[PDB]
Amino acid sequence: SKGEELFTGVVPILVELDGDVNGHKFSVSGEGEGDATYGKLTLKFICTTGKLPVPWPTLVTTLVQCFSRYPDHMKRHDFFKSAMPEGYVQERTIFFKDDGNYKTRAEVKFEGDTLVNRIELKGIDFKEDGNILGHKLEYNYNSHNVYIMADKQKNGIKVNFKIRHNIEDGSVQLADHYQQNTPIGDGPVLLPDNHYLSTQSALSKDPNEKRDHMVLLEFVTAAGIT
Ligand code: NA
Numbered sequence: 441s442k443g444e445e446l447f448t449g450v451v452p453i454l455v456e457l458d459g460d461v462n463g464h465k466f467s468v469s470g471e472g473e474g475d476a477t478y479g480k481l482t483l484k485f486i487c488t489t490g491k492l493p494v495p496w497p498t499l500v501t502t503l504v505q506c507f508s509r510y511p512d513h514m515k516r517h518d519f520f521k522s523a524m525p526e527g528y529v530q531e532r533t534i535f536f537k538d539d540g541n542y543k544t545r546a547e548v549k550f551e552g553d554t555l556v557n558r559i560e561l562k563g564i565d566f567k568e569d570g571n572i573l574g575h576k577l578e579y580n581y582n583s584h585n586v587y588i589m590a591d592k593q594k595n596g597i598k599v600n601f602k603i604r605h606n607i608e609d610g611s612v613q614l615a616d617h618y619q620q621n622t623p624i625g626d627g628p629v630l631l632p633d634n635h636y637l638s639t640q641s642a643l644s645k646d647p648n649e650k651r652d653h654m655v656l657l658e659f660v661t662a663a664g665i666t
């Protein structure tokens with residue numbers, strides 16, 4: 441409705457994250473655009489503090505599900521856009537198997553015509569020689585499904601899914617994601633029936649960019665109903 445009409449065209453996106461993983465502090469700034477009509481996201485992220493101390497793929501999920509394409513028949517299940525423009529809080533705990541965890545809190549809302557994702561990330565219990573702090577993950581990203589359920593008690597949603605990061609030896613580093621989103625405003629939101637978002641992502645590098653960075657192209661579509 442009101443929220444849905446804010447995404448019918450191309451919307452500029454800004455992402456700002458401050459992180460601390462095992463005491464390694466860093467900041468990331470991202471810019472790009474989203475076109476929910478095609479579930480399309482294009483963004484470029486920059487580590488503004490120097491070298492990123494964790495692998496870029498591990499930050500992908502943290503670094504705007506309101507850009508998902510919801511088929512017309514599923515639009516009544518789109519919580520994310522319904523919370524706009526006031527926005528929502530997105531919180532996650534990401535458990536890296538046999539390693540540490542990230543806890544994140546983000547506020548996603550409009551500032552003017554720009555969709556902004558402001559994030560604080562805290563990582564603890566990482567192994568200094570593990571796949572994360574040791575940078576043993578390939579610079580790529582597998583397709584992932586996100587499973588969404590209503591959470592009535594918080595007037596929001598609960599989300600869970602698995603991400604499998606590719607290790608450079610051919611193995612896999614699992615990152616189990618637990619997520620909750622709650623509206624910032626007190627207006628009504630769409631509480632959905634169970635469904636999922638199917639996402640595909642491609643990571644690349646800007647050949648003229650010398651700062652540590654990540655270019656991302658992502659397509660996201662809601663599914664699972666009718
Ligand atoms: Na402890």
